[PDB]
Amino acid sequence: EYEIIDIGPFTQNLGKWAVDEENKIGQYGRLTFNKVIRPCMKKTIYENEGFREIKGYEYQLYVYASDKLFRADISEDGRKLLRFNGAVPPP
Numbered sequence: 001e002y003e004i005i006d007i008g009p010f011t012q013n014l015g016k017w018a019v020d021e022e023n024k025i026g027q028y029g030r031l032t033f034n035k036v037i038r039p040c041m042k043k044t045i046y047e048n049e050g051f052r053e054i055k056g057y058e059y060q061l062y063v064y065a066s067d068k069l070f071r072a073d074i075s076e077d078g079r080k081l082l083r084f085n086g087a088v089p090p091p
Helices: 007-025
Strands: 002-004 035-048 052-064 069-077 078-088
Touching: 007 035, 007 052, 007 069, 007 078
Parallel strands: none
Antiparallel strands: 002 035, 035 052, 052 069, 069 078
């Protein structure tokens, strides 16, 4: 269940991390961070086993980088950039 959050400093810093992670690959070239826009979605990732309930969180962000928009799926327990693809601006 992806719930919607507000685009504060934490959301802006999550998009900065994703842009810097895609920059590590060099696939999209040198991307410069601009802004994470709305909507930003958050979902709780529960553990599959063990004595801890919450494993981490997954974020779906719309980020501008190099004056272009990209969709970024991020997991933070541990930090993973699962998806980064050009995106059309949402309604």
